[model samples]
Target: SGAIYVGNYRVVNRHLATHNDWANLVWEDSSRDLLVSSTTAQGCDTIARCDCQTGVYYCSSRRKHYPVSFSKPSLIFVEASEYYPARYQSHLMLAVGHSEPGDCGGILRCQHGVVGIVSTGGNGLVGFADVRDLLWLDEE
Candidate 1:
């Protein structure tokens, strides 16, 4: 009836594979060839474009957030500077051009950075990388 969770989808830094079987391009030599996927609102990306037109969202189906919220919006974004340099916030966009709504019913469940998503290992995006302003949000 409200917000929906969409991704946790696989996106690339320079480009997204055009082929449907793009999963093949994934690094497989090492079991630790972890993917740095795009953060998403919910684990499951079930909502469609039509849902966006009417302002609808889903919390999760699979690969969902531990505590999902479906209240008109499943994701929100705070400034990288204010939130924390190494913090990872998964935001969702129902309508491609609607941008994202800031206000919503939810909480930022705090957790330590893990090796797979935000860790010292190459498995995830390195937090120390933020030492350079390039990874931080610079004032526009």
Candidate 2:
């Protein structure tokens, strides 16, 4: 496990040894509020699982604020016919948030549950990679 400081946040990106064999990226605030990003069973499905509000929080030195948090009233299934097509099944799109460049890998939470990781953002939306699609590569 390793820790990095981002503004007033201490970020821990560690791989846990468990049945799921997953890794998590956690953000520790100065006030000790933890925002963790871990793998989930939910994917890009809109019908059953993706029908809820989602949010993300990250540290950005570029901003005047120490930490920034953004929330979408609902999760957007880019693959749905009503929305634009997604490039990949792991891609999750959310409403426009003033996300910074280094915000990638931030935790994406929905209904107080971890779901995905921030990937990229632009064009009035932020993109995330489904946490379920993450695979921990064991090192020798």
Candidate 3:
């Protein structure tokens, strides 16, 4: 097996939620080479977290960027599949209108900031792990 890579960054830490289908990754960018910015999404007034009905977007490995809406603030559980076991307190739900393979690992953004990471999607819905819960690697 080979180490996984996200763009030019090397993955240093990876985590999968035991109860949720969502996962998170930490990459080595100690030099701060990647350009980053922070901005708020229009109509997303709250600074705390993403609210239901807020518009969001995600771009996955397939390079397809599409618009979706936050449908739930928190999802307690989701049915398990062969690839991902039944999850609890795992992810936030999205009303994604499209379906395609390779949609996982996309950064879910609200322009307000990163709301979550795309975990799973199908049949006009998606799941994203909240960024707040995925920050365990920050202490490293």
Candidate 4:
């Protein structure tokens, strides 16, 4: 009785399911289907999430890298604004990730052309307003 499928893609990247879905362009990988993309894929937002499906495509956009290089920039890639987690789960800080549109709407990151997904902590907001009381259980 939760979010019901609306169209082609089952759910959005973050799991807000489609009801709270704000991002666009959801795609999958072909080579290894390991998960990848631009915007949320590029690592521009604060948080990111990828599909658990096998054989996910890892793609990236150029705008995400150098926006100043272009004369008239367009959505060259999609952009999502959210508070993402830090790399190693250390002191929480804002991170900007990228994720392309018309592609899988999952959080993706690009490093030297290599794309990746935020496997953990994609469950949604976890920190408090003061950055305290984060969503946790303790004793992992």
Give the per-residue lDDT of model 2 (tens digit) for 32-87.
11233434332332111343444544434233212223343233434322222343
| Residue 51 lDDT in candidate 3 | 57
lDDT of 3 by residue, 7-61 (tens): 2222211232122211222332211111112212222222224353555555554
**In model 3, what is the error at residue 65, expressed in angstroms?**
1.4
- Cα RMSD, each candidate: 16.3, 13.3, 10.7, 16.5
- Per-candidate TM vs. native? 0.16, 0.37, 0.50, 0.19
Write down the lDDT that model 4 would get.
0.23
Give every collision pair in model 2: none
2 or 3: which has the higher lDDT?
Answer: 3
| TM-score of candidate 1 against the unseen true structure | 0.16
Rank all candidate structures by their TM-score, best first, as comma-separated numbers: 3, 2, 4, 1
List model 4 lDDT by residue over 1-140, tens digit each.
01112222222233222322334434322211121122322222222122111222222332232111111111111123243323222222122233333222322322221122222222231110011111111111
Instruction: Give the residue spans of candidate 3 off by over 4 A.
Output: 1-53, 59-62, 99-101, 132-140
Off by more than 4 A, model 4 = 1-9, 20-56, 60-82, 87-140
lDDT of each: 0.22, 0.36, 0.42, 0.23
Query: Would you give me the overall lDDT of model 3?
Result: 0.42
